Amino acid sequence: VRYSLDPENPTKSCKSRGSNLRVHFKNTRETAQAIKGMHIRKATKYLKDVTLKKQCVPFRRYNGGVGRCAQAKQWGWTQGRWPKKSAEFLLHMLKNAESNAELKGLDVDSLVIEHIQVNKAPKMRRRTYRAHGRINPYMSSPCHIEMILTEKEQIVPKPEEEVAQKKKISQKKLKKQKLMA
Amino acid sequence: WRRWHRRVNTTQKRYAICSALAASALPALVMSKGHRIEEVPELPLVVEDKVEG
Amino acid sequence: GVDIRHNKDRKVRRKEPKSQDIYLRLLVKLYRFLARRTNSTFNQVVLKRLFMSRTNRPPLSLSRMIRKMKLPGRENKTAVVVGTVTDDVRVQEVPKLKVCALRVTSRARSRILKAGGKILTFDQLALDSPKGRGTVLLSGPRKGREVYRHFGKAPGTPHSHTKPYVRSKGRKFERARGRRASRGYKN
Amino acid sequence: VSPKVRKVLQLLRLRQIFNGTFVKLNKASINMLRIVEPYIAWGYPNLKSV
Amino acid sequence: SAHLQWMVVRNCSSFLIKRNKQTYSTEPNNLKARNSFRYNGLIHRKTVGVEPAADGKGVVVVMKRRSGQRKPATSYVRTTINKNARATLSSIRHMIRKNKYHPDLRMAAIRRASAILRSQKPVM
RNA sequence: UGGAAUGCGAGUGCCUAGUGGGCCACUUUUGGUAAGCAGAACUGGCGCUGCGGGAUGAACCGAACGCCGGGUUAAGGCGCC
RNA sequence: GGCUAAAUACCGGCACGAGACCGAUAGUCAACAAGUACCGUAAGGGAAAGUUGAAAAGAACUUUGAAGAGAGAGUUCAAGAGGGCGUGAAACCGUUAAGAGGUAAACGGGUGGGGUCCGCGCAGUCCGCCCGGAGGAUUCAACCCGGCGGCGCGGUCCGGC
Numbered sequence: 001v002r003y004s005l006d007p008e009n010p011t012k013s014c015k016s017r018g019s020n021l022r023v024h025f026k027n028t029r030e031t032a033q034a035i036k037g038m039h040i041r042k043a044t045k046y047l048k049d050v051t052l053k054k055q056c057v058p059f060r061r062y063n064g065g066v067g068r069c070a071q072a073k074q075w076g077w078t079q080g081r082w083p084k085k086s087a088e089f090l091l092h093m094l095k096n097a098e099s100n101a102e103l104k105g106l107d108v109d110s111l112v113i114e115h116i117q118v119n120k121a122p123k124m125r126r127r128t129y130r131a132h133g134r135i136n137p138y139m140s141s142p143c144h145i146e147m148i149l150t151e152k153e154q155i156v157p158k159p160e161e162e163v164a165q166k167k168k169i170s171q172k173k174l175k176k177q178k179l180m181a
Numbered sequence: 182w183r184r185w186h187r188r189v190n191t192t193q194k195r196y197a198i199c200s201a202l203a204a205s206a207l208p209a210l211v212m213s214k215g216h217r218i219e220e221v222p223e224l225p226l227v228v229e230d231k232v233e234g
Numbered sequence: 235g236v237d238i239r240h241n242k243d244r245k246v247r248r249k250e251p252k253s254q255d256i257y258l259r260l261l262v263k264l265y266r267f268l269a270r271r272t273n274s275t276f277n278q279v280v281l282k283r284l285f286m287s288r289t290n291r292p293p294l295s296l297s298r299m300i301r302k303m304k305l306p307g308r309e310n311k312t313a314v315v316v317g318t319v320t321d322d323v324r325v326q327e328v329p330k331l332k333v334c335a336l337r338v339t340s341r342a343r344s345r346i347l348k349a350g351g352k353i354l355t356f357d358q359l360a361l362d363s364p365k366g367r368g369t370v371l372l373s374g375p376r377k378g379r380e381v382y383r384h385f386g387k388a389p390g391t392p393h394s395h396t397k398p399y400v401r402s403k404g405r406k407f408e409r410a411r412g413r414r415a416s417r418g419y420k421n
Numbered sequence: 422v423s424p425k426v427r428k429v430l431q432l433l434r435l436r437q438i439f440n441g442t443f444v445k446l447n448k449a450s451i452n453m454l455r456i457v458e459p460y461i462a463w464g465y466p467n468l469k470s471v
Numbered sequence: 472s473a474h475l476q477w478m479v480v481r482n483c484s485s486f487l488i489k490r491n492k493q494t495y496s497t498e499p500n501n502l503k504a505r506n507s508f509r510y511n512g513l514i515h516r517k518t519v520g521v522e523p524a525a526d527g528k529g530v531v532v533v534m535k536r537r538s539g540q541r542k543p544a545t546s547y548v549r550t551t552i553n554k555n556a557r558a559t560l561s562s563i564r565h566m567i568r569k570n571k572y573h574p575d576l577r578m579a580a581i582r583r584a585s586a587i588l589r590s591q592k593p594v595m
Numbered sequence: 596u597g598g599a600a601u602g603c604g605a606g607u608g609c610c611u612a613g614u615g616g617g618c619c620a621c622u623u624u625u626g627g628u629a630a631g632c633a634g635a636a637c638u639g640g641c642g643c644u645g646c647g648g649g650a651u652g653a654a655c656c657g658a659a660c661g662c663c664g665g666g667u668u669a670a671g672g673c674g675c676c
Numbered sequence: 677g678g679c680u681a682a683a684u685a686c687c688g689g690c691a692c693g694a695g696a697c698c699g700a701u702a703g704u705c706a707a708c709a710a711g712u713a714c715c716g717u718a719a720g721g722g723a724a725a726g727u728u729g730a731a732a733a734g735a736a737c738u739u740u741g742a743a744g745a746g747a748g749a750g751u752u753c754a755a756g757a758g759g760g761c762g763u764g765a766a767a768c769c770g771u772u773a774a775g776a777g778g779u780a781a782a783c784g785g786g787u788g789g790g791g792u793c794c795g796c797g798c799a800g801u802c803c804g805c806c807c808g809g810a811g812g813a814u815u816c817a818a819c820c821c822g823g824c825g826g827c828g829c830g831g832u833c834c835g836g837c
């Protein structure tokens with residue numbers, strides 16, 4: 001595994017990545033550019049608003065046909081959308097990265113999204129049936145994502161309503177563990 | 182049925198054999214062929230018939 | 235701009251033998267020096283002919299050499315031909331000749347030598363006749379070739395005795411129409 | 422250049438522009454100079470010019 | 472003869488190097504490593520060769536004896552000169568001029584001997 | 596006294612590709628009301644050819660072209676562009 | 677009416693040998709579960725598709741996640757070789773860095789500015805002879821001995837081929 005960039009101080013950084021993820025590449029490249037440079041607590045808070053349609057992801061490069069909204073004015077841009085799957089996929093990668101920071105004994109409340117890159121993955125093939133007995137591609141556009149988090153001097157403790165939540169138990173995880181045991 | 186084979190006149194073939202043998206008695210030509218004959222006593226190098234056995 | 239045509243600037247003529255023979259080129263080196271460093275035009279003419287192609291160096295028959303070397307005033311001169319001296323069986327008696335040639339056929343050597351004659355090589359002629367003195371330069375017939383039968387006016391034109399190109403020769407091969415008045419016409 | 426002018430200019434040896442030659446005058450040559458009249462400037466040179 | 476043998480090797484020889492618009496000859500007794508009729512060390516009856524001694528002291532002068540042209544073993548006479556720089560050249564100059572042994576190689580031999588001797592000095 | 600001037604080295608032989616739609620201008624010229632029309636003679640052009648001028652332009656005017664420095668010109672120009 | 681071996685032919689078959697042939701879009705359609713998959717009612721039509729590593733040593737174990745996926749750890753010379761894995765181009769794309777941006781971009785000539793690096797620059801060459809100061813010697817010429825070599829019209833020496 002090689003990342004496009006290298007951490008400046010590897011002892012103060014945590015990595016995360018994912019490949020062949022079935023979330024639109026175009027929506028996700030825009031979503032990642034929004035959180036570039038964000039503090040992790042701010043970044044996590046932001047992506048949850050995007051799911052609730054309380055903050056938009058400005059569509060700056062892949063904006064052909066994208067509509068206008070009042071929340072894109074926050075970014076000095078007229079076009080914005082709320083890609084829910086892109087936000088949710090990045091919330092999982094951030095959660096994985098934050099756990100990686102803990103495994104390395106890093107102050108998770110000081111992490112900043114320093115590098116984040118969305119790459120096109122190999123495209124998955126389906127087909128759609130067209131008029132006059134013709135068949136055309138129906139292609140998914142998955143992506144690879146990689147993010148590096150670094151420590152900075154600004155500290156944001158985690159929200160109170162978030163640290164008080166129960167460690168959710170998954171029955172299906174218990175079943176498999178019992179079967180292995 | 183490409184024409185793989187060439188007829189060469191007999192007289193010209195024998196000429197070539199004569200020129201190759203004449204050029205084999207000259208140290209310069211044998212040297213220029215890369216042969217290490219800097220110490221062979223003589224050219225042409227004739228050795229008694231015992232070796233045939 | 236200068237008003238001149240350039241189609242004739244480059245003269246077509248040999249400056250060296252197309253042949254890669256190393257003995258021919260050693261003679262050309264020899265006669266390059268002689269032609270340059272002597273005022274003899276015989277040296278220049280010989281040098282030129284060493285470049286000439288095979289068909290520009292026709293063979294000289296033994297009979298023709300004797301005929302040209304028998305003319306008055308040519309006694310005790312060296313016959314010089316840049317080419318091959320072939321033999322002529324049609325000759326009965328060969329006199330004593332002194333010849334210089336590039337090649338002499340095996341049977342022409344025995345006949346010339348048996349009569350007391352001498353056969354030189356062009357490197358020996360230079361030592362004997364550096365300027366070409368006392369020589370008789372001789373050439374074989376240049377139009378003595380089957381090709382020159384076919385050149386000239388096309389065979390189907392009036393008073394054109396050119397030889398046509400026919401695969402076979404006989405009554406059935408280009409003799410009917412155009413070659414007799416009975417079939418169309420003749421000319 | 423017309424074929425007649427072109428031939429007369431080569432005979433005078435004026436094959437290039439601003440080329441100069443001396444010509445000794447007589448009925449044969451004065452009539453040649455008339456043919457190339459549009460293509461030449463000519464006159465009588467004095468000793469210093471020569 | 473030399474001229475006949477040059478015509479066979481002038482462009483076909485295992486010693487011929489044609490590279491970078493340059494032509495060289497790597498045979499022994501070639502005082503300039505030059506693919507040339509004059510400096511070819513094989514085709515002439517008499518040749519001069521200058522080489523460094525097996526130990527890095529002095530030069531070895533090679534001259535081709537007259538008699539055994541077809542006998543490579545006895546053809547060449549080797550002489551080792553390990554004198555001072557000026558003395559070495561003087562011997563080489565005399566071995567050529569006084570004997571009239573290829574007088575046209577005199578300076579080529581003398582220039583080669585200087586280059587070999589200069590090479591044998593300590594490297595700075 | 597190689598018998599006008601001028602200029603110029605010539606002669607000769609084989610093998611031979613492409614081409615065989617052309618078109619334009621001065622002068623001359625047929626048909627047509629005429630045509631940026633159709634058809635001819637002569638030369639020269641474009642085609643195959645850039646370059647300076649004609650703002651622009653196949654052909655007009657000047658002039659034909661290796662890569663450069665200096666100088667001078669042609670046809671054209673010199674209010675500003 | 678009739679028979680008859682041999683010398684001759686042989687892109688099928690069995691078994692071999694070789695090559696100035698091709699080298700995975702080539703060479704047979706077929707280097708591989710190819711006359712296979714698949715298409716057509718049928719006669720017929722008919723592909724794509726080779727490569728981890730020397731050796732599976734094919735990544736135990738910890739941790740986040742429902743999982744796919746990750747972060748550590750480990751094997752290996754190398755996973756910067758991780759099971760459609762040798763190398764890994766271009767087009768196309770992500771990000772980073774630098775520069776710039778109203779006559780679409782691109783382009784020829786001439787400079788200028790800025791970077792990337794290179795000279796592995798920064799008191800600037802080397803060589804011969806001669807003059808002079810200081811030194812140090814496997815110390816010079818000339819003669820003697822020995823070896824080798826070139827040439828000799830040795831005006832015409834002997835012997836050899």
Ligand SMILES: [Mg+2]
Nearest residue numbers: 063064065066
């Ligand atoms: Mg649109």
Ligand SMILES: [Mg+2]
Nearest residue numbers: 064065066067
């Ligand atoms: Mg719409």
Ligand SMILES: [Mg+2]
Nearest residue numbers: 131132133134
């Ligand atoms: Mg249908």
Ligand SMILES: [Mg+2]
Nearest residue numbers: 235236660661
């Ligand atoms: Mg010119």
Ligand SMILES: [Mg+2]
Nearest residue numbers: 238239240241
């Ligand atoms: Mg031309």
Ligand SMILES: [Mg+2]
Nearest residue numbers: 240241242243
């Ligand atoms: Mg020509």
Ligand SMILES: [Mg+2]
Nearest residue numbers: 618632633634
């Ligand atoms: Mg017309």
Ligand SMILES: [Mg+2]
Nearest residue numbers: 616617642643
């Ligand atoms: Mg055309």
Ligand SMILES: [Mg+2]
Nearest residue numbers: 640642643644
């Ligand atoms: Mg033309």
Ligand SMILES: [Mg+2]
Nearest residue numbers: 641644645659
């Ligand atoms: Mg033009």
Ligand SMILES: [Mg+2]
Nearest residue numbers: 649650651652
């Ligand atoms: Mg105008």
Ligand SMILES: [Mg+2]
Nearest residue numbers: 664665666667
């Ligand atoms: Mg100029």
Ligand SMILES: [Mg+2]
Nearest residue numbers: 678679680681
């Ligand atoms: Mg029968």
Ligand SMILES: [Mg+2]
Nearest residue numbers: 700701725726
């Ligand atoms: Mg393949």
Ligand SMILES: [Mg+2]
Nearest residue numbers: 700701702703
């Ligand atoms: Mg194939």
Ligand SMILES: [Mg+2]
Nearest residue numbers: 700701702725
């Ligand atoms: Mg392929």
